[PDB]
Amino acid sequence: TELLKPRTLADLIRILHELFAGDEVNVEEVQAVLEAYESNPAEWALYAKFDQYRYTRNLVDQGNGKFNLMILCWGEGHGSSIHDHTDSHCFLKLLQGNLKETLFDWPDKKSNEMIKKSERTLRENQCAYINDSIGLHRVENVSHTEPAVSLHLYSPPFDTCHAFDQRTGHKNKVTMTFHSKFGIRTP
Ligand SMILES: [Fe+2]
């Protein structure tokens, strides 16, 4: 339970393996360790594979089945749907640039406009946390000039979620795909 500052991305991953050795998750400790890693672009360049048209998901570590650790690369103006997290913990740490996170409540069964609960600007090295009990979110790179790169940890791993129609609250199941795994493009 003794948390030390990760010296490198590799060191962070080693620490994460320790933190997820059991069946439960100390959220505050995981967030603190992620926050404490100082982004070093040389260490994650291998995973930072962008697409011109949308954000990409790049698998870094499979957490011996306990978690997926991945790097997401957001071109200028790229963003996500309003989505849930499939009964998993979700940690988001900025490695480069800024992202806007908008929070939404779970919709009622009635067809209605989903109104923003709040928004914040997540900045370099900051780590946010979300789960389904907190609500839904959208994550966007609103920059016109700066690509963003973020480090995401989901536990347990999941490869499907829901996207919500902002106009109605209607949801559709979506399958998440990986752009690359362990530095290797996986078309
Ligand atoms: Fe998310």
Swiss-Prot record:
InterPro entries found in the cross-reference section: CDO_1 (IPR010300), RmlC-like_jellyroll (IPR014710), RmlC_Cupin_sf (IPR011051)
Protein role: Catalyzes the oxidation of cysteine to cysteine sulfinic acid with addition of molecular dioxygen.
Family: Belongs to the cysteine dioxygenase family.
Induction cue: By increase of sulfur amino acid intake.
Swiss-Prot/TrEMBL cofactor(s): Fe cation; Ni(2+); Zn(2+)
Gene responsible for this protein: Cdo1
Catalytic activity: L-cysteine + O2 = 3-sulfino-L-alanine + H(+)
Ligand binding (Fe cation): 83, 85, 137
Pfam families reported in the protein's UniProt record: CDO_I
GO MF annotation, one: ferrous iron binding
Metabolic or biological pathway, per its Swiss-Prot or TrEMBL entry: Organosulfur biosynthesis; taurine biosynthesis; hypotaurine from L-cysteine: step 1/2
Cross-link entry 3'-(S-cysteinyl)-tyrosine (Cys-Tyr), positions: 90-154
PTM section of the record: The thioether cross-link between Cys-90 and Tyr-154 plays a structural role through stabilizing the Fe(2+) ion, and prevents the production of highly damaging free hydroxyl radicals by holding the oxygen radical via hydroxyl hydrogen.
Species whose genome carries this gene: Rattus norvegicus
Subunit structure as annotated in this protein's UniProt entry: Monomer.
GO biological process, one term: response to glucocorticoid
Entry protein name: Cysteine dioxygenase type 1
Tissue: Highest levels in liver. Significant expression also in kidney, lung and brain.
Cofactor note as given: Binds 1 Fe cation per subunit. Ni(2+) and Zn(2+) can be used to a lesser extent.
Keyword field: Dioxygenase, Iron, Metal-binding, Oxidoreductase, Thioether bond
GO cellular component: cytosol
Enzyme Commission identifier(s): 1.13.11.20
Domain of life: Eukaryota
